[PDB]
Design a protein around this motif. Structure first.
Motif, PDB file in Angstrom:
ATOM      1  N   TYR B 247       2.163  -0.714   1.578  1.00 15.55           N
ATOM      2  CA  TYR B 247       2.175  -1.755   1.959  1.00 15.55           C
ATOM      3  C   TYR B 247       3.201  -2.981   1.715  1.00 15.55           C
ATOM      4  N   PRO B 248       4.250  -2.896   2.320  1.00 18.25           N
ATOM      5  CA  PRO B 248       5.808  -4.074   1.899  1.00 18.25           C
ATOM      6  C   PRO B 248       5.665  -5.284   1.461  1.00 18.25           C
ATOM      7  N   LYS B 273      -4.979 -12.887   4.157  1.00 18.63           N
ATOM      8  CA  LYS B 273      -4.644 -12.169   5.510  1.00 18.63           C
ATOM      9  C   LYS B 273      -4.454 -11.169   5.349  1.00 18.63           C
ATOM     10  N   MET B 274      -3.823 -10.153   4.446  1.00 17.43           N
ATOM     11  CA  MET B 274      -3.695  -8.222   4.190  1.00 17.43           C
ATOM     12  C   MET B 274      -5.277  -7.820   3.989  1.00 17.43           C
ATOM     13  N   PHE B 275      -6.665  -8.844   3.286  1.00 20.08           N
ATOM     14  CA  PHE B 275      -7.404  -8.051   3.221  1.00 20.08           C
ATOM     15  C   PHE B 275      -8.531  -8.858   3.937  1.00 20.08           C
ATOM     16  N   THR B 276      -7.858  -9.632   4.643  1.00 17.81           N
ATOM     17  CA  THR B 276      -8.656 -10.227   5.941  1.00 17.81           C
ATOM     18  C   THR B 276      -8.295  -9.566   7.591  1.00 17.81           C
ATOM     19  N   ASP B 279      -7.214  -3.699   8.586  1.00 14.30           N
ATOM     20  CA  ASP B 279      -7.095  -2.694   7.114  1.00 14.30           C
ATOM     21  C   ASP B 279      -6.694  -3.302   6.233  1.00 14.30           C
ATOM     22  N   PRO B 280      -7.786  -3.537   5.773  1.00 10.97           N
ATOM     23  CA  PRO B 280      -7.139  -4.182   3.942  1.00 10.97           C
ATOM     24  C   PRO B 280      -6.952  -2.737   3.262  1.00 10.97           C
ATOM     25  N   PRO B 281      -5.857  -3.798   2.371  1.00 11.30           N
ATOM     26  CA  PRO B 281      -4.852  -2.582   2.168  1.00 11.30           C
ATOM     27  C   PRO B 281      -6.144  -2.456   0.617  1.00 11.30           C
TER      28      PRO B 281
END
Lengths: 144, 526, 148, 143, 232, 96
Positions: B247-248, B273-276, B279-281
């Motif tokens: 995940y860059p 925003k990524m975990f919202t 697909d949460p990293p």
């Protein structure tokens, strides 16, 4: 009490407190109108604080022309948070609450009673002690 | 011209001076006897000023031994004098000259090394000289009997062999001896970034083993911590090593936060925003110890700079880190529990509001919700750091200490926080104030002793009594140790395992009262 | 050239201590290359910037990219090719302080240069090697352009 | 370029890349390392190759071929230090990840693995977990 | 410790002098012991001045009213001549010492050469001379102010001119000025243990009265009764 | 017991540094110790100064005529100066 007996008063004192706020911006026609009332003006329009995306001057930038000579002064705005002088942002102010006149230029801060009023060490006092009574008279009238 | 008129006087200065016969006297005597002149008066000049200082010393030293004073005092005095003279007069150039005349120092070095004080002398000489050949050879060879880090990392092969031996000792150290086994390795790894990246990659590959590679991962994180202590950013190391490359956005965000050693609403907003997103990293991707310490010092010191629109974002990301269950189906997150998320975030929110409000009595007001909410582990850590920074203020005990009570909820209800709590109170047991007199300092110390005895009752017994033994042998007066034994034998129930006796009773030899001490000693020796 | 400094920064915080001026925000920005910390007051009303943006920053002695001195006076009718045409936001200020980690024994490794664009304050902290162009009571132009 | 790398990395006490190394590099130098990469002491070569990591991800992505060639040179130096950093960092300048099948015929890495594999396997009991597990709820902790 | 560290000039650390002074001045300072003795005497008389201030101001209040603002004048000297504090200065410490000495000779309140006039001259300008020697000490002048030679000469000239402008003009009706300056605040004075204040108390002080409204003795204790509440 | 014309005596620790016992410690630093002072109603300065275990140096009155009768003209000059300085500076204003 070895201090100025007269300072800046009600309307102009409130208005110069609002004027020297960090976020006062004046366009070209406004500053050209204001410089008419500056008697000591040498006739050179200063370089604007912001050139692009539009020319804009700051209130401190215009007030630096009102300050005569090359007087130097340090005071604190009335709402100066004590413990600001200990933090990392000592010589840069988040609230813009430390007034620093440098070489006759107001480079930072908001002016108030504690810097333009009758208190000993105020900017008008240093103007009197440095530039003499005549230049301080012109300074008073130009501020007004 | 002939140097006789000068070199003979150079030698005769060392002949006719007071007391030089016992020496380079042979070399100068040879330079003179080959130069001619008066060699008969030379011997008379050598023996004229022979004051017999040596036999004076015979008389004096044997009279001190006649006095019944310990001769080992004389040994220590002479050794200290001569060693100090060496250190004050040590010349690194002449050490390298001893190396030059022969690579291996003659048997005087190998006879000195038998003496512990001379071994320490060579350590202090050679630990500071990474290029003097004699000194580097001595430190390296004594390691074969500190391995100097310059010669530790000068090539792969030496670094690797000392690395694997030292790491074997660390793994043999379990959970206590690492404190001594890790720095010698860690400071060896923390000298260059290439030895660093190599050791980190080796430990990363080793960590994939499910048969204890978790511990190698732990030690790698510890070495990264130390590399940060040497002011070197290993952010991109952990990025390109772990799943940051997957995940860059998380990569750049987290790595920036780690490189600064501080947080920011920008990278935090990226992770939010990524975990919202749907697909949460990976939650493992953010579960990094120093990162979560950044969360602690953002949310629990006075300040830092904070916006309310991001306060909840920091809180929710920490809740996702501390709550979510990602099950790997062969390294595939297929089940995501986020059901224990909202309660954790709510508790973190309330506790951080309290902690950054700079609370005392108001703590006791809402202590109900506190001890309700310390059951969350991450919240327990956050309150621990907050109360640490409040109580670590100089002279915070002269004004309310309720805060020390909260550890009772923490350590009792969370086993793995036993090491932190004691390792907090080790500082607080060394509290010293000129305002709060030694009476009040001893009062606080005895309070902390009661806390440590309670923490011993939860099973953290080996390091408690080991540190109690160390500080008695040091600092901790006999009154404090007697009060320790008083409270212990007043609270601990028999049987007492020998793993506890082995340190508690041989330090209890100093006293015999608090009678329960007699019962304890009799039971534990019989 | 007359470019005392150039870099690319990214905004890591917008208004950290809470909003205190309805038209001005105190951006905190990091540089990926030089690793300079930047604090900079920006008039967001005319040049809105939000969190996570990126921008080329340039501190220059002049704008005419020939070494010709600016004269420090507003000339709206300038035919010379101005460097400001390559940038979106242009401010003009005076460096009023250069602090550092120097002792009486050794020179500074880290320097912090403070500039006042008419009141809008900027601090630029970093290694001393990149801040040798800054000298106190000299006029500077801050040229900022957002990067995609 | 070689003497430039000397003047930016002459100090041997720092075996790390100097902080802000991309700035103490330049994209011209990012290309021009290949001219005199093998001219300096091997320590300086190492410090340069490690400086490749702190450079911004995008700047490396633009000049990925240059750092690829530089790592290919790094895989040739007599000092094994340069060989293994090249081995680890082969993929980074274009992929963004590092090699991890690192038992690559180096007898030193072979010694490390051949000892510590079975040492760790023996020390699985009471294997001190990473420090992340402390802060996690029980369900993820067990999972 | 802090006073000696901040004011006693150091002529034994070469590094500091290289950082603060040009190399020729550093060699001059380190070479000959005459200048070193002069700086030692400067620091010694500053210590004597410190003891004099200690006995004059037992309460430790450093705020005091004096004619010439030395710090503001130093700042004006810095910004007139464009002093770069980042570079070593070209000002001899010995030149600073001799300049302050001859300046203090030039500042005259009472003139004459007999012992009486000289003692009155010393006493009249004692405090300002102490402040001048402490402010323009070569230590601070070389460390924090970093003034050049021409800047220092301009500063001495300005101090002289402003001090001469500060002397009271003869013929000034200081009695009436004092009366008005003490009468004006009475128009603002109001009245809120309980002690009389305001214009009643000022009245009684000027209207000297045998009957105080609230006579009192702020009596102090010296033994252990000063701290022991029981004994007090 | 007690000296006449002394109808009440209030004992207290002054939290303001002006009346605190300011000393110079061996390091040369100013330290303001907190010590009990007694402030009374009614004055007899000769008697109270003559008492035992009383500080005869710092003990003063607010009655100027008492000071003149017991101490002298320079003492009452100084005491008058301090008293009218106190009554002026009480409200925060300043005069030269």
């Amino acid at each position: 009490s070895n201090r100025p007996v007269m300072g800046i008063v009600q309307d102009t004192l409130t208005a110069v407190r609002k004027f020297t706020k960090r976020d006062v911006f004046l366009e070209r026609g406004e500053v050209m109108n204001l410089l008419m009332f500056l008697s000591t003006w040498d006739g050179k329009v200063p370089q604007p604080a912001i050139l692009k995306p539009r020319p804009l001057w700051t209130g401190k930038q215009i007030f630096s022309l009102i300050i005569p000579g090359h007087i130097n002064c340090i005071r604190t705005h009335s709402t100066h948070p004590d413990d600001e002088d200990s933090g990392p942002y000592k010589h840069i102010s988040p609230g813009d609450t430390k007034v620093v006149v440098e070489n006759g230029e107001l480079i930072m801060g908001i002016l108030c009673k504690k810097s333009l009023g009758t208190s000993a060490g105020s900017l008008v006092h240093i103007s009197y002690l440095e530039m003499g009574h005549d230049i301080t008279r012109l300074f008073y009238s130009n501020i007004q | 011209g002939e140097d006789d008129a000068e070199v003979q006087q150079e030698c005769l200065h060392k002949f006719s001076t007071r007391d030089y016969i016992m020496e380079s006297i042979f070399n100068t005597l040879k330079r003179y006897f080959q130069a001619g002149g008066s060699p008969e008066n030379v011997i008379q000049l050598l023996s004229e000023n022979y004051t017999a200082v040596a036999q004076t010393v015979n008389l004096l030293a044997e009279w001190l031994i006649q006095t019944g004073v310990e001769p080992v005092q004389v040994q220590e005095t002479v050794e200290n004098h001569l060693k100090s003279l060496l250190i004050k007069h040590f010349d690194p150039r002449k050490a390298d000259s001893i190396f030059t005349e022969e690579g291996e120092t003659p048997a005087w070095l190998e006879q000195m090394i038998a003496h512990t004080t001379w071994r320490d002398l060579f350590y202090k000489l050679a630990e500071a000289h990474p290029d003097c050949l004699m000194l580097n050879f001595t430190v390296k060879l004594i390691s074969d009997a500190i391995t100097s880090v310059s010669t530790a990392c000068q090539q792969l092969e030496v670094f690797s062999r000392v690395l694997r031996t030292s790491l074997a000792t660390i793994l043999d150290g379990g959970e206590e001896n690492l404190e001594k086994n890790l720095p010698e390795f860690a400071k060896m790894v923390c000298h260059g970034e290439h030895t660093y990246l190599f050791a980190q990659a080796m430990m990363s590959v080793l960590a994939q083993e499910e048969q204890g590679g978790s511990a190698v991962r732990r030690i790698a994180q510890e070495v990264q911590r130390f590399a940060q202590e040497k002011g070197h950013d290993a952010s991109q190391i952990t990025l390109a090593l772990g799943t940051a490359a997957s995940y860059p956005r998380a990569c750049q965000a987290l790595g920036a936060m780690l490189s600064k050693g501080a947080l920011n609403p920008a990278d935090i907003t990226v992770l939010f925003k990524m975990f919202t997103s749907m697909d949460p990293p990976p939650v493992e991707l953010i579960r990094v110890p120093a990162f979560l310490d950044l969360f602690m010092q953002s949310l629990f010191k006075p300040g830092a700079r904070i916006n309310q629109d991001h306060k909840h974002k920091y809180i929710h990301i920490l809740a996702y880190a501390a709550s979510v269950v990602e099950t790997w189906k062969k390294n595939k997150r297929v089940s995501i529990n986020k059901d224990e998320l909202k309660s954790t975030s709510k508790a973190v929110e309330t506790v951080h509001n309290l902690c950054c409000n700079e609370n005392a009595s108001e703590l006791v007001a809402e202590l109900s919700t506190l001890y309700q909410c310390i059951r969350f582990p991450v919240v327990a850590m956050g309150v621990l750091k907050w109360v640490d920074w409040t109580v670590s203020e100089p002279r915070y005990f002269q004004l309310q200490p309720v805060h020390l009570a909260l550890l009772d909820e923490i350590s009792t209800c969370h086993q793995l926080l036993h090491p932190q709590v004691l390792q907090l109170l080790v500082k607080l047991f060394e509290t010293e104030h000129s305002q709060l007199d030694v009476m009040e300092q001893l009062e606080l110390k005895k309070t902390l002793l009661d806390r440590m005895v309670h923490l011993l009752s939860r099973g953290y017994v080996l390091p408690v009594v080991s540190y109690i033994r160390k500080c008695l042998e040091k600092d901790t007066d006999i009154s404090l140790i007697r009060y320790f034994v008083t409270e212990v034998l007043d609270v601990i129930a028999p049987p007492y395992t020998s793993d506890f006796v082995q340190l508690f009773l041989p330090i209890l030899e100093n006293d015999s009262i608090a009678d329960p001490v007699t019962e304890f000693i009799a039971h534990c020796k019989s | 050239a007359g470019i005392l400094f150039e870099d690319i920064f990214d905004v890591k915080d917008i208004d950290p201590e809470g909003k205190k001026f309805d038209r001005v925000s105190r951006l905190h920005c990091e540089s990926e290359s030089f690793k300079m910390d930047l604090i900079l007051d920006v008039n967001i009303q005319i040049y809105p910037v939000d969190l996570g943006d990126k921008f080329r920053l340039v501190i220059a002695s002049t704008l005419y990219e020939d070494g010709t001195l600016d004269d420090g006076e507003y000339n709206p009718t300038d035919d010379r090719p101005s460097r400001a045409d390559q940038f979106e936001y242009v401010m003009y200020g005076k460096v009023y302080r250069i602090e550092g980690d120097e002792t009486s024994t050794e020179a500074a490794t880290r320097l912090s240069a403070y500039v006042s664009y008419g009141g809008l304050l900027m601090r630029l902290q970093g290694d001393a090697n990149n801040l040798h162009g800054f000298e106190v009571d000299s006029r500077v132009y801050l040229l900022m352009k957002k990067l995609a | 370029t070689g003497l430039w790398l000397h003047n930016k990395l002459g100090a041997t006490d720092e075996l790390w890349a100097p902080p802000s190394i991309a700035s103490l590099l330049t994209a011209a130098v990012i290309d021009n390392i290949r001219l005199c990469f093998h001219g300096l002491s091997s320590a300086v070569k190492l410090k340069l190759l490690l400086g490749t990591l702190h450079l911004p991800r995008r700047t490396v992505d633009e000049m990925k071929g240059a750092l690829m060639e530089i790592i290919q040179l790094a895989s040739l130096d007599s000092d094994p230090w340069v060989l293994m950093v090249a081995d680890i960092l082969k993929s980074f300048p274009d992929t963004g990840s590092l090699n991890l099948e690192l038992e690559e015929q180096n007898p030193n890495v072979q010694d490390i693995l051949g000892e510590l594999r079975e040492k760790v396997g023996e020390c699985e009991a009471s294997a001190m977990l990473p420090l992340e597990c402390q802060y996690l709820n029980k369900n993820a902790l067990t999972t | 410790k802090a006073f000696e560290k901040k004011f006693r000039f150091d002529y034994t650390n070469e590094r500091a002098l290289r950082r603060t002074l040009q190399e020729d001045l550093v060699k001059d300072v380190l070479s000959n012991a005459h200048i070193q003795n002069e700086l030692e005497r400067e620091f010694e008389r500053m210590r004597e001045d410190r003891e004099v201030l200690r006995v004059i101001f037992p309460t430790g209040d450093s705020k005091v009213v004096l004619p010439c603002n030395l710090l503001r004048m130093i700042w004006n000297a810095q910004k007139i001549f464009h002093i770069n504090p980042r570079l070593p200065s070209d000002l001899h410490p010995i030149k600073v010492v001799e300049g302050v000495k001859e300046l203090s000779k030039k500042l005259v309140i009472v003139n004459g050469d007999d012992p009486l006039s000289r003692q009155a001259q010393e006493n009249a300008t004692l405090l300002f001379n102490i402040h001048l020697r402490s402010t323009l000490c070569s230590r601070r002048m070389a460390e924090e102010f970093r003034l050049s030679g021409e800047a220092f000469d301009w500063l001495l000239g300005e101090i002289e001119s402003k001090f001469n402008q500060a002397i009271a003009h003869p013929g000034e009706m200081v009695g009436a000025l004092a009366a008005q300056s003490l009468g004006e605040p009475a128009t603002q004075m109001t009245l809120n243990k309980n002690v009389t204040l305001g214009v009643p108390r000022l009245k009684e002080l000027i209207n000297i009265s045998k009957k105080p409204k609230t006579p009192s003795l702020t009596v102090f204790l010296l033994g252990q009764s000063a701290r022991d509440a029981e004994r007090a | 017991q007690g000296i006449e014309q002394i109808s009440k005596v209030y004992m207290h620790l002054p939290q303001t540094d002006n009346k605190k016992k300011i000393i110079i410690t061996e390091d040369g630093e100013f330290k303001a110790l907190q010590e009990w002072i007694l402030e009374t109603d009614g004055v007899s300065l000769m008697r109270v100064l003559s008492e035992k275990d009383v500080d005869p140096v710092r003990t003063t009155s607010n009655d100027i005529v008492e000071i003149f009768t017991v101490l002298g003209i320079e003492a009452v000059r100084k005491a008058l100066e301090r008293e009218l300085y106190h009554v002026i500076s009480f409200d925060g204003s300043y005069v030269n």
